[PDB]
Amino acid sequence: GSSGSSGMSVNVNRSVSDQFYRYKMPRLIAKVEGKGNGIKTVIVNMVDVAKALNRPPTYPTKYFGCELGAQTQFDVKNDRYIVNGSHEANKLQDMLDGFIKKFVLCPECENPETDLHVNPKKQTIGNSCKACGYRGMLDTHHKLCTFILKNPPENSD
Numbered sequence: 001g002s003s004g005s006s007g008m009s010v011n012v013n014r015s016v017s018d019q020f021y022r023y024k025m026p027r028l029i030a031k032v033e034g035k036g037n038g039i040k041t042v043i044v045n046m047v048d049v050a051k052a053l054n055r056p057p058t059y060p061t062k063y064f065g066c067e068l069g070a071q072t073q074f075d076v077k078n079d080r081y082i083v084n085g086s087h088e089a090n091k092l093q094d095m096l097d098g099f100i101k102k103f104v105l106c107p108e109c110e111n112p113e114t115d116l117h118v119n120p121k122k123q124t125i126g127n128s129c130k131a132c133g134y135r136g137m138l139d140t141h142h143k144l145c146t147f148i149l150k151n152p153p154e155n156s157d
């Protein structure tokens with residue numbers, strides 16, 4: 001029984017420097033091959049991190065591409081996600097931070113106990129927080145929105 005744990009997780013947010021935060025998320029992993037001759041980043045821990053955030057990897061995965069300004073591959077069959085370009089986990093984490101700071105967490109209470117809503121008629125995205133009581137329409141993204149609309153989030157029973 002090695003001294004300690006096997007896998008360590010970081011705080012839901014990269015702004016807190018304490019060990020009191022209950023909710024935790026597994027540090028995403030980014031893989032890279034070659035250099036220039038077809039170098040691309042593959043977020044192996046794309047599906048994992050998602051589940052933890054109670055959200056699909058399609059939300060974050062897509063983001064990376066936007067910010068990075070590159071293309072991305074989506075394969076549900078093998079749940080494999082690829083992001084054109086070279087980016088180390090360290091960086092990817094930061095880039096995602098933002099998303100996990102507004103989408104996931106609440107801009108009022110910063111609680112991961114929030115959700116998102118999609119309107120096919122109004123064609124506008126909006127979140128609703130219960131912890132504090134915040135509501136509104138998320139700034140219509142550039143491409144993401146287009147994807148979200150075409151394919152709404154998964155419902156629960």
Ligand SMILES: [Zn+2]
Pocket residue numbers: 106107108109110111129130131132133134
């Ligand atoms: Zn809130």
